[PDB]
Design a binder for this molecule. Structure first.
Ligand code: HEM
Ligand SMILES: [Ca+2]
Ligand SMILES: [Ca+2]
Length: 329
């Protein structure tokens, strides 16, 4: 089918997303960049979608965290999300697109901007959010492994799928975990969607990067990098440890797992039999940049091996002296 602007797609109904695509790339994504806004817009996909439970309710990927900001941005777990929410709300208002449809679209376009990224299946047609998400639905970085997995599981996710989605932390920084140090990335390459997250969190912690005593934070191996308590533990918990380790220097799996597990999440509360497939609009991602490595000044001896069945893949290390990670602009 042929859209007005000459660009083409499978379902002609998907032609509404083209100008929307161009606007987000220009006016939300700084000129289609893998920077701050993409990271927080991707986090938003999770925060909207995970508001879903067979027991407690919630509409999942329904766009509620926008239409009900005043209720949901006041969730402790939703701390610091009000930004991107206020940042996105003008577009949802402006464009012929529902709130739920916009969040998952933006997250999908954002990831396509990151080198090493993957095209995420996007479905158009989510109806308007009917009520606010309930609380206790977004997990927090100080929740135990069991609480986190039970929560994701209740929403529809196996332990292995949790690990796959946490590949998002490879293009991710924290603002409210340690507020003394905002824009502090979860690994050394927040502009590049790669395996450096799963690698560097397996490292033995060395230091607190900002202030010593923050809830949900543990020691990090790198000045300029923050490690979540939840990520620290998942990488060392027998339920998730071997899978975590399998993402190391395994880009295609990272991309593939993430692409499929995200479409599922972007569908929580939704039926894709009643949605239109507009996946062929999501841009082609830039190629991966750099290779998987230990950080400079590290060896295999600095890795805390947590997988009982398979030992940590021996990687090389950056040369020169040990350094620090620039915070996210
Ligand atoms: C499963 C348990 C999870 C926990 C405990 C957790 C926790 C966190 C925390 C505390 C932050 C930093 C917020 C702050 O600034 O204080 C963060 C950032 C982020 N999260 Fe997660 N998260 C989880 C899962 C996910 C999932 C499923 C996604 C899927 C997209 C995701 C995507 C992101 C992204 C992209 C950021 C970076 C935000 C930015 O740099 O603007 N996370 N996470
Ligand atoms: Ca919701
Ligand atoms: Ca990275």
């Amino acid at each position: 089918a042929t859209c007005a602007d000459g660009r083409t797609t499978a379902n002609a109904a998907c032609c509404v997303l083209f100008p929307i695509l161009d606007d987000i790339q220009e006016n939300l994504f700084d000129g289609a960049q893998c920077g701050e806004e993409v990271h927080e817009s991707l986090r938003l996909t999770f925060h909207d979608a995970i508001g879903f439970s067979p027991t407690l309710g919630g509409g999942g990927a329904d766009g509620s965290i926008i239409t009900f900001d005043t209720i949901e941005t006041n969730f402790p777990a939703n701390a610091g999300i009000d930004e991107i929410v206020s940042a996105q709300k003008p577009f949802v208002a402006k464009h012929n697109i529902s709130a739920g449809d916009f969040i998952q679209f933006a997250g999908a376009v954002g990831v396509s901007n990151c080198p090493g990224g993957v095209r995420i299946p996007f479905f158009l047609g989510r109806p308007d959010a009917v009520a606010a998400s309930p609380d206790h639905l977004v997990p927090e970085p100080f929740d135990s492994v069991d609480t986190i997995l039970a929560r994701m599981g209740d929403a529809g996710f196996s332990a292995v799928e949790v690990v796959w989605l946490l590949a998002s932390h490879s293009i991710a920084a924290a603002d409210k975990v340690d507020p003394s140090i905002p824009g502090t990335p979860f690994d050394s390459t927040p502009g590049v969607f790669d395996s450096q997250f799963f690698i560097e969190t397996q490292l033995k912690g060395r230091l607190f990067p900002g202030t010593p005593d923050n809830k949900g934070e543990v020691q990090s191996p790198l000045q300029g990098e923050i490690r979540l308590q939840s990520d620290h533990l998942l990488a060392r918990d027998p339920q998730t440890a071997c899978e975590w380790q399998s993402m190391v220097n395994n880009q295609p799996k990272i991309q593939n797992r993430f692409a499929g597990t995200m479409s599922k999440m972007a569908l929580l509360g939704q039926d894709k039999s009643k949605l239109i497939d507009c996946s062929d609009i999501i841009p082609t991602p830039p190629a991966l940049v750099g290779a998987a490595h230990l950080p400079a000044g590290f060896s295999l001896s600095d890795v805390e091996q947590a997988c009982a069945e398979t030992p940590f893949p021996a990687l090389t290390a950056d040369p020169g002296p040990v350094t620090s990670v620039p915070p996210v602009p």
